[PDB]
Amino acid sequence: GHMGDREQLLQRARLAEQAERYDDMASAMKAVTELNEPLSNEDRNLLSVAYKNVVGARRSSWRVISSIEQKTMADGNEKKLEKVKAYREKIEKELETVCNDVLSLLDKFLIKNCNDFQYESKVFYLKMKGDYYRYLAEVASGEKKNSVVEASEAAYKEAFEISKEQMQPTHPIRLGLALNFSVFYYEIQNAPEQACLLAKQAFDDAIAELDTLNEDSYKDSTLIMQLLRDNLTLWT
Amino acid sequence: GDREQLLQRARLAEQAERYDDMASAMKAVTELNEPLSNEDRNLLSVAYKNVVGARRSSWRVISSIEQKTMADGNEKKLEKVKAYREKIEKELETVCNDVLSLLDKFLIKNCNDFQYESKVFYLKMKGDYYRYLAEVASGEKKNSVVEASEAAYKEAFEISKEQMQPTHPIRLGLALNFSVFYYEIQNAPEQACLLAKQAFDDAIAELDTDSYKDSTLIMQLLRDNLTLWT
């Protein structure tokens, strides 16, 4: 009952979210997932919100320290550059552990248990799989970068094929997937034209059907659509 | 082991907003038993204020949920909320105890009788972290840290009054926090209002004095608190 593992961990995650303690929240949601039971829409949101904040703090710290590594490299201070790169690598290792934790959960529990008729869940988890491989690609190099870049694209591609065949263009999950996948082309693959076509098509397909949406669905769809529009403006 | 490398790590961690790393680095600098410069004092104060501030904010949220759960009579949920509140509480106390240990063993102890600015800074810091302990304690446990908080604040205030101008930002910050201690911690709003008004009026009377921005903001805070306390 209320003393069960799932109930206590979910309660901890909800409290951790209120306290803005997202490492606690993600660890609790990771343990919920490992129970090998399906996640509801709320539980899926708690897991996604928790790890978005956890990886996002590391990404923000990584970019700040990596930017200093660039300036310190150009400035040429070996006594300083060696320690700066060491600090970034410590941040990278935290970042890679977080991403690998997520991908393990997706590969072993979340994607695994999706029934073929659970299209929403598959699109959600496959997009998440592409997202966290992309975060790995943001810091990777050499042959390691190639594998995660290919993994991210492959997850995004399968998710987008399912979403196009199973979700209306105004669906926030499909709209968010198209947004993140176009960001993958622009930022990871350095493919601006491919990125612009994907985002433009997604915006055009959605905006053709906004007028049928209710007030609440309209707000959810247009908020992602504005991000597609802002990306398009910035990409040319 | 190298002092300069630790300070660089503290500065790197601050830029990345990783304040646990920054506090850990400045903890090691203090433990070298060498004096802290003005910049070093700032790095140490910034690091631990951010670390404890996150615990304080998290504690306040969970504590209020604990009270609401208690009023609703949900005993089963209350036990789980309390367990999280206690977990956050112990982290907060460990952070404060670490700072207080650094102050009582390295910073305050190594101050000379003529290092007035450092002594006021550290004694005020000691009152702050005893006040943060008092925020989460009750009963005899609270009274212990409350008495320790007031003692540190008063010695700092006496030194600052004798050695610092009324518009010194360190003296103004000490008066601001000392008045907060009287109001919030020990329920003496009249004593708090009297102290905040003394420091603000003394600062205005000598307002004809390069560090204006640092002093000015604290002065606005003194007035803002006085308005809230009416």
């Binding site: 909800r14 979210e17 209120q18 829409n41 709320e42 949101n45 708690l46 996604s48 919100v49 978005k52 997202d131 709209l175 968010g176 997937l177 947004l179 993140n180 960001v183 622009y186 930022e187 908020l223 992602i224 991000l227 802002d230 990306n231 910035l234 990409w235 | 700032n42 104060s45 910034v46 204020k49 951010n50 702050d128 103004l172 910050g173 000490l174 601001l176 926090n177 907060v180 109001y183 919030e184 640092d214 903001l217 604290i218 805070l221 803002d224 608190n225 809230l228 306390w229």
Partner: peptide, 21 residues
Amino acid sequence: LRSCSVTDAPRSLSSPTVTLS
């Protein structure tokens, strides 16, 4: 409430994961 104490002293946009809490 909450008396004040002494204070201390482009990339592409991806989808926000808004909470339902």
